[PDB]
Design a protein around this nucleic acid. Structure first.
Length: 48
DNA sequence: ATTTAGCTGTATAAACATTGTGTTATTGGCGTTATTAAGGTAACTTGCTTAT
């Protein structure tokens, strides 16, 4: 009904799924996704 | 015979024993705060890497 390309709607869902999969199976020991995101933000701040 | 020394008797005394009583303490319980997971989000990027 809205006039827009479907690629962006598909892209957001694909990106969310990939990030979630990486966090869930990223390490042999399961680590919380919220804990992982804060660690990623801290690492980016340290790099800057 | 007499008593004397011997013997510890059992009450008593003392110690224990038993009873009772207090105390406390911990389980349970409840709720509680730390934690946490998932859902959802939509300009666009629509056959890869990855390698002696």
């Amino acid at each position: 009904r809205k006039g827009f390309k479907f690629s962006t709607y598909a892209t957001w869902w694909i990106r969310q799924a990939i990030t979630r999969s990486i966090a869930d199976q990223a390490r042999t020991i399961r680590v919380p996704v919220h804990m992982i995101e804060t660690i990623n933000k801290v690492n980016r701040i340290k790099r800057q």
